[PDB]
Structure 1
Amino acid sequence: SELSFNYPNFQSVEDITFQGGASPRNETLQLTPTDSNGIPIRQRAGHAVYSQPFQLRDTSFYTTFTFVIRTTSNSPADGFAIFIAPPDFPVKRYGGYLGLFEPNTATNTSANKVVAVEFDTWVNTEWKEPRYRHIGIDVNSIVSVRVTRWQDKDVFSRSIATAHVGYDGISKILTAFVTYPDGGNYVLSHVVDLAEIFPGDVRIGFSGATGQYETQYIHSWSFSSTSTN
């Protein structure tokens, strides 16, 4: 279906729903919480999602957002993702699960219905993932179907980074381009029929998790979807 929205900042959150440990703070989406001294709280997850459902049948979409990861250590955890799931998808487990999965079914594709672009700051050995920090595309599993190295100079830049995420409903291809000012550029694509996975309604939004010594912020976000008929 057709939907568009545009948040240059989050002084308004009229149509944003916050769950779990996410909240609106300093004109941003703050995905995980901090205590009264600004210290990230451990083992928390949260979601900030656009509140209106949409459909993926015969649809392409384009979305772009800017983000900051604030780390206070050389060993931050766990990252964040932009995701799509049914409208009643809840905040799931903290830590390496990124608010999107739970331990007993995290790598079981038949037990999940969630697609995401993850920004993964903590190398987990509890399931298969690369031995360095990475950006990936997740289809129904915490084990990414396409994954690439995220350079530490970018992870730790404290820059306002940009993501572009698009879905071509004709070719059935999800793509992310991530850019850093005077930094790295990242390109990932994967063939996935989202309308097959999601024959009804979905919502799009962000999930963040700790971990430790890391807060994830969304500074701006826009979206448009169009019929491919």
Structure 2
Amino acid sequence: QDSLSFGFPTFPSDQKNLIFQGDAQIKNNAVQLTKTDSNGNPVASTVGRILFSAQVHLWEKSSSRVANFQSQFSFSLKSPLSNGADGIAFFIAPPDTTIPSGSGGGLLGLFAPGTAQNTSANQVIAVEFDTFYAQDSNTWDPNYPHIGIDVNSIRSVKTVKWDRRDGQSLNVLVTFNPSTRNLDVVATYSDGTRYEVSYEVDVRSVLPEWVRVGFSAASGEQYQTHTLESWSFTSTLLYTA
């Protein structure tokens, strides 16, 4: 299809169109990307991802069209401690994408240790909400919590300082305009605190014509819950000048 859109105001337990990878599972009408004990508390060393089953036609070689898409979602992070890790990310990748070996902790379940920074060894665009930046294990990270745009590397091509608020939902709007090649990210907390980051990227040279969209989250030695509360997506193929 040239156009596709779906919306999850909440996440009831009877899902049919979600691909669950790792420890991701539905609990209390929300998607818990990372494992949690019976008490509902986060645990260490866990990775989980979800992907919508239907493939998205991102671009079409023949017609020379590229899709304009918008992804809106909200999530909350909660941890008994305060050093919650490692973060959640919205990502777009080839349809057969699976959790890379050893992609836990700081790699957010998106990259392999040996290629995490090799741009010609990956095919993935992601918007990360990174809460852990210890310079010994996350050497590629700026020294503070941040929202980043990742293009084939765990080392963000663009970042903006961000504030982690335990238990508070962050509302996010991610949009890609094929006309200007701009991938814009706008995140806001209910009190109006706003964060914005954008980057110009030609999706055609990074991803295949058909892709799958979803989320990924991980906790290494440090942990926190990564709860996806809602999600709506829309893509429409458009002719570009």
Are 1:84 and 2:89 matched, yes or no? no
Matched, 1:59 2:67: yes
The CA distance in 1 between the partners of 2:166 and 2:88, in whole Å, is 16
How far 1:218 moved relative to its partner?
0.7
Counterpart-to-counterpart distance in 2, 1:213 and 1:227? 39
Shift of 1:156: 2.2
Among candidates 35, 39, 42, match of residue 37 of structure 1: 39
**2:52 partner amino acid:** Y
Return the match for 2:187 from 172, 175, 178. 178
- 1:180-199 equivalent positions in 2, closer than 5 A: 180-199=189-208
CA contact (8 A) 2:125 2:149 kept: yes
- Which structure 1 segments of 5+ residues have no match? none
Give the Cα separation in 2 of the matches to 1:34 and 1:61.
Answer: 32
Q: Which runs of 5+ in 2 are unaligned?
A: 60-65
Residue in structure 2 matched with residue 102 of structure 1 by the alignment: 112
Question: Could you tell me how far apart the structure 1 residues matched to 2:87 and 2:208 are?
Answer: 29
**What TM-score results when the alignment is normalised by the length of structure 1?**
0.95
What is the aligned partner in structure 2 of residue 74 from structure 1? 82
Aligned residue number for residue 205 of structure 1: 214
Q: 2:17 aligns with which of 15, 29, 46?
A: 15
Structure 1 contact 81–118 (Cα < 8 Å) conserved: yes
2: CA distance, partners of 1:203 / 1:197: 14
Q: Deviations over 1:156-195 (max 9, x none)?
A: 2411220000000111111110000115211111011112
Q: Distance in 1 between matches of 2:149 and 2:40?
A: 31
**Distance in 2 of aligned mates of 1:181 and 1:25:** 23
What are the Cα deviations for residues 28-68 of structure 1, in whole angstroms up to 9, with x where unaligned?
11100012233322111110111111121121001100111
Q: Secondary structure at the match of 2:106?
A: helix
Specify the alignment match of 1:149 in structure 2.
161
User: 10-19 vs 110-119, which deviates more?
Assistant: 10-19
User: d(CA) in 1 for partners of 2:196 and 2:46?
Assistant: 29
Once residues 225 and 40 of structure 1 are traced to their aligned partners in structure 2, the CA distance between those partners, rounded to angstroms, is 34
Matched AA of 2:149: I
Runs of 4+ in 1 over 4 A off after TM superposition: none
**1:26 alignment partner in structure 2:** 28
Percentage identity across paired residues of the two chains:
43
Task: Supply the distance in 2 between the matched residues of 1:48 and 1:8 (Cα, whole angstroms).
Answer: 16
Number of corresponding residues:
226
Q: Deviations over 1:48-101 (max 9, x none)?
A: 111111121121001100111112112111001000000111123110000000
Query: 1:138 maps to what in 2?
Result: 150
- For residues 204 and 169 of structure 1, the distance between their equivalents in structure 2, rounded to whole angstroms, comes to 17
